[PDB]
Amino acid sequence: SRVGKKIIDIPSDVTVTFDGNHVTVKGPKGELSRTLNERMTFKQEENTIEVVRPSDSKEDRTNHGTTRALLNNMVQGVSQGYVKVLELVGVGYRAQMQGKDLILNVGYSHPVEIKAEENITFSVEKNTVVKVEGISKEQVGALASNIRSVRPPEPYKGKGIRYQGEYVRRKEGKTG
Amino acid sequence: TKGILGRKIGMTQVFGENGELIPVTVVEAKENVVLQKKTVEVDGYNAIQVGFEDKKAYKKDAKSNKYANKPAEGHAKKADAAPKRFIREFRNVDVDAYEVGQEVSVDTFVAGDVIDVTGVSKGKGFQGAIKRHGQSRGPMSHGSHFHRAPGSVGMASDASRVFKGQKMPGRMGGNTVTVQNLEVVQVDTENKVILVKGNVPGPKKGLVEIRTSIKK
Amino acid sequence: MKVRPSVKPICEKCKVIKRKGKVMVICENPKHKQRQG
Amino acid sequence: MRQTFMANESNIERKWYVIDAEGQTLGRLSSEVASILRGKNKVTYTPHVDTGDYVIVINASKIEFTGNKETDKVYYRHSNHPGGIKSITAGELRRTNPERLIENSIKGMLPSTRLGEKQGKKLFVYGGAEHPHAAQQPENYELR
RNA sequence: GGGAUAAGUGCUGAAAGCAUCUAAGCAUGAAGCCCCCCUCAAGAUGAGAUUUCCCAACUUCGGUUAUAAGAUCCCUCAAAG
RNA sequence: UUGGCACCUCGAUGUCGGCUCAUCGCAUCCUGGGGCUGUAGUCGGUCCCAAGGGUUGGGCUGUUCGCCCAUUAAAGCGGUACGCGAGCUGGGUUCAGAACGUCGUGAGACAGUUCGGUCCCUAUCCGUCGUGGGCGUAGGAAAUUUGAGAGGAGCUGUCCUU
Ligand SMILES: [Mg+2]
Ligand SMILES: [Mg+2]
Ligand SMILES: [Mg+2]
Ligand SMILES: [Mg+2]
Ligand SMILES: [Mg+2]
Ligand SMILES: [Mg+2]
Ligand SMILES: [Mg+2]
Ligand SMILES: [Mg+2]
Ligand SMILES: [Mg+2]
Ligand SMILES: [Mg+2]
Ligand SMILES: [Mg+2]
Ligand SMILES: [Zn+2]
Numbered sequence: 001s002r003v004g005k006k007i008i009d010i011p012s013d014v015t016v017t018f019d020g021n022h023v024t025v026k027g028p029k030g031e032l033s034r035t036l037n038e039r040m041t042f043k044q045e046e047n048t049i050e051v052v053r054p055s056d057s058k059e060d061r062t063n064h065g066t067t068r069a070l071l072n073n074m075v076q077g078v079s080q081g082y083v084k085v086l087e088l089v090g091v092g093y094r095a096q097m098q099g100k101d102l103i104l105n106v107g108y109s110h111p112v113e114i115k116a117e118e119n120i121t122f123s124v125e126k127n128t129v130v131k132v133e134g135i136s137k138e139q140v141g142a143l144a145s146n147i148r149s150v151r152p153p154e155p156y157k158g159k160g161i162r163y164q165g166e167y168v169r170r171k172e173g174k175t176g
Numbered sequence: 177t178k179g180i181l182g183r184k185i186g187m188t189q190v191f192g193e194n195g196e197l198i199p200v201t202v203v204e205a206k207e208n209v210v211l212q213k214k215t216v217e218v219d220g221y222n223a224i225q226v227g228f229e230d231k232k233a234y235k236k237d238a239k240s241n242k243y244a245n246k247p248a249e250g251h252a253k254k255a256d257a258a259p260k261r262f263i264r265e266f267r268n269v270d271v272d273a274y275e276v277g278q279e280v281s282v283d284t285f286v287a288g289d290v291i292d293v294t295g296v297s298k299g300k301g302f303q304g305a306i307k308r309h310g311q312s313r314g315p316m317s318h319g320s321h322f323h324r325a326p327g328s329v330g331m332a333s334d335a336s337r338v339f340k341g342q343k344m345p346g347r348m349g350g351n352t353v354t355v356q357n358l359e360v361v362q363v364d365t366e367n368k369v370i371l372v373k374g375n376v377p378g379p380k381k382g383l384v385e386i387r388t389s390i391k392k
Numbered sequence: 393m394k395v396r397p398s399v400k401p402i403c404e405k406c407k408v409i410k411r412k413g414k415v416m417v418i419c420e421n422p423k424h425k426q427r428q429g
Numbered sequence: 430m431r432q433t434f435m436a437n438e439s440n441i442e443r444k445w446y447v448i449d450a451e452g453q454t455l456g457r458l459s460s461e462v463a464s465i466l467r468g469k470n471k472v473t474y475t476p477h478v479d480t481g482d483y484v485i486v487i488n489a490s491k492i493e494f495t496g497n498k499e500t501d502k503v504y505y506r507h508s509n510h511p512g513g514i515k516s517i518t519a520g521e522l523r524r525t526n527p528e529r530l531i532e533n534s535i536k537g538m539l540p541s542t543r544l545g546e547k548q549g550k551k552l553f554v555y556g557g558a559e560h561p562h563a564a565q566q567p568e569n570y571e572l573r
Numbered sequence: 574g575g576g577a578u579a580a581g582u583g584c585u586g587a588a589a590g591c592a593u594c595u596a597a598g599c600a601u602g603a604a605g606c607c608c609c610c611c612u613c614a615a616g617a618u619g620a621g622a623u624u625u626c627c628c629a630a631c632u633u634c635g636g637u638u639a640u641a642a643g644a645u646c647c648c649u650c651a652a653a654g
Numbered sequence: 655u656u657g658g659c660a661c662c663u664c665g666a667u668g669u670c671g672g673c674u675c676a677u678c679g680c681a682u683c684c685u686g687g688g689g690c691u692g693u694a695g696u697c698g699g700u701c702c703c704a705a706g707g708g709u710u711g712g713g714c715u716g717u718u719c720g721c722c723c724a725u726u727a728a729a730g731c732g733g734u735a736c737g738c739g740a741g742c743u744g745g746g747u748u749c750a751g752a753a754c755g756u757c758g759u760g761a762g763a764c765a766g767u768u769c770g771g772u773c774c775c776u777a778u779c780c781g782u783c784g785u786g787g788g789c790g791u792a793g794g795a796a797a798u799u800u801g802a803g804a805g806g807a808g809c810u811g812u813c814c815u816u
Binding site for chain 1 (some may be wrong): 693814
């Protein structure tokens with residue numbers, strides 16, 4: 001597992017501390033704690049961390065890769081954070097902030113309210129660009145996915161909520 | 177959530193604010209007293225036990241249920257109440273809002289309250305499948321010798337038996353029935369009566385239990 | 393989704409995967425989505 | 430010449446044991462407990478009388494399964510009413526009634542005889558770490 | 574209305590530097606499943622719980638006794654049959 | 655399903671259709687949830703999950719089928735001795751009468767037709783629906799109860815507004 005073998009750089013402002021399997025990373029933006037695979041060892045260097053698997057079995061290789069990726073994600077999340085940007089397409093499709101919660105008006109007979117979660121921030125720009133900011137890459141992805149699933153992009157005019165870089169397949173509509 | 181016990185007096189009608197004819201059942205609910213308070217600590221669940229309709233005091237050679245026996249008299253005297261004809265528990269109320277020995281007046285309910293009413297339905301005795309289970313008759317003519325019989329009770333070798341739940345002649349009525357979402361049309365505190373919209377199970381003089389409707 | 397015993401690439405972009413014990417084909421072309429069954 | 434000893438109620442001594450389900454496999458713990466209940470571990474074993482001991486099983490909620498039995502082992506029962514099949518997975522039953530899980534596992538390993546029913550009545554199962562039978566002064570028993 | 578799910582939909586994610594809903598992990602998702610609603614139910618022989626009532630004489634001193642609380646016989650009845 | 659075989663039943667295992675009462679499977683007719691679409695929308699097509707419930711009256715014919723009229727969200731397909739005659743019917747069909755066509759010298763005959771034509775049984779056991787008595791539940795009693803389990807229910811139209 002090349003991903004597992006790869007070493008994780010720790011920014012000076014980020015501190016990683018292990019408690020058996022459980023690990024916790026603190027940084028400027030917040031704190032992230034989780035339990036990693038119990039069979040993976042950690043070489044905790046002063047400026048870097050390395051993940052070591054005990055064997056070369058299938059399970060060990062897979063878990064080595066995933067453990068390294070998750071720990072790197074935690075470190076980069078505390079350091080730089082993660083952001084996902086969605087945009088609204090369609091005339092009248094708008095978004096706005098009701099304090100911390102996000103209210104969307106997308107072609108339904110009712111507005112849709114999305115309640116903000118801990119460690120997550122919503123920001124609306126131009127009434128048509130929502131962005132979710134957090135330290136948890138997983139949480140950011142999950143909430144962006146929920147916002148998109150309120151009304152995902154349709155193929156005939158591209159209307160709905162999409163990730164800003166998302167490619168939307170398009171189909172011709174009416175034909176003779 | 178509220179509860180009270182009464183006797184079914186009979187049905188009548190009242191004219192509503194727009195002149196609509198409202199069928200009503202008159203329920204006399206005097207002499208309700210909280211006899212016991214059951215709790216999770218002592219009993220494992222919360223409920224108030226209510227006793228309804230004073231009966232006579234204990235006497236030596238009593239021959240009917242009109243006179244309280246010694247166990248019942250002691251039970252009621254513990255609540256400082258006269259012994260009661262009917263005793264039922266309400267689990268749907270907040271026990272902390274009641275005191276043992278307290279009266280439960282018809283005024284606990286107010287007009288417009290939606291209620292569930294429980295009683296024992298009228299008995300019909302031994303009844304056949306047409307009446308008891310609402311089955312269809314056979315032909316009354318065209319040579320038929322099948323009028324009110326219950327019809328086939330099974331199939332054949334498979335299964336060489338009658339399944340449980342087969343509907344057959346037997347005793348009819350006299351079952352506990354709850355009618356949901358009736359309404360309190362009126363409360364008459366002078367007469368200790370509640371006018372309930374519609375009809376409720378049981379014969380006249382039958383015991384009925386009124387509770388705040390469970391569905392909301 | 394195509395549900396059939398014969399699951400296999402239909403174009404060069406089709407990708408054979410295994411999810412929850414089931415052989416599947418995923419593709420950029422939705423017509424090519426397959427699930428063995 | 431007939432000389433085989435026969436146990437009877439005058440000379441049978443039934444002791445009380447406690448067995449900890451925690452970290453134990455359902456079936457393996459169950460077979461060993463069943464032997465104990467039947468008295469198969471006594472030199473005075475006598476088939477027509479109960480020479481077994483009493484068993485308390487604690488931490489039933491921490492009994493464990495192998496494979497995918499948690500979601501795939503299904504317990505079926507029938508109410509003797511048409512279409513009256515009801516089912517519950519081993520995992521759900523462990524969550525909601527671990528005592529019943531262990532009891533049924535063990536009792537399925539005892540004979541369906543009057544004596545087997547009686548012997549199965551000597552089992553007491555508890556989901557947690559406590560039991561109410563200190564008065565019987567049970568001894569810890571090590572499996573295997 | 575709640576919990577867990579099906580077909581599905583995804584998030585994060587390696588095995589396989591990419592990709593990937595899946596392996597670990599995390600969501601979501603049916604008139605269906607378990608409940609919520611109604612009825613029966615401790616012969617549930619695993620026979621459960623709470624409140625109240627009765628409580629002595631005689632004994633070959635193991636035990637017995639008619640009585641207690643209570644319930645019936647018989648009788649007047651119906652909302653019950 | 656049409657058959658093949660001839661293994662249970664010829665000191666009898668009543669046979670079509672209907673009626674009454676259902677019950678189960680799911681390969682789903684409607685309703686619920688989904689993928690793909692040569693899915694603009696309204697409609698559809700096809701496939702997947704799903705058996706909770708629901709799934710109509712009439713004309714003709716013994717009919718089952720089937721066609722037709724009028725509805726419906728829909729008018730599912732199958733098993734249960736082609737479920738059910740000690741529950742009903744008895745129109746068809748394979749007893750005796752009579753007749754036509756036909757065949758036969760004839761007596762008669764025909765998976766040709768026609769008119770008529772005896773459906774017994776007081777439930778012992780299991781099973782099922784109701785309803786009592788005994789004993790048990792470590793004193794004898796009156797009331798109130800928990801809920802292990804079990805049963806019930808579970809369907810859908812149309813219109814207004816957006
Ligand atoms: Mg009829
Ligand atoms: Mg007649
Ligand atoms: Mg092919
Ligand atoms: Mg014979
Ligand atoms: Mg299917
Ligand atoms: Mg006519
Ligand atoms: Mg038949
Ligand atoms: Mg028959
Ligand atoms: Mg005839
Ligand atoms: Mg003739
Ligand atoms: Mg001739
Ligand atoms: Zn392709």
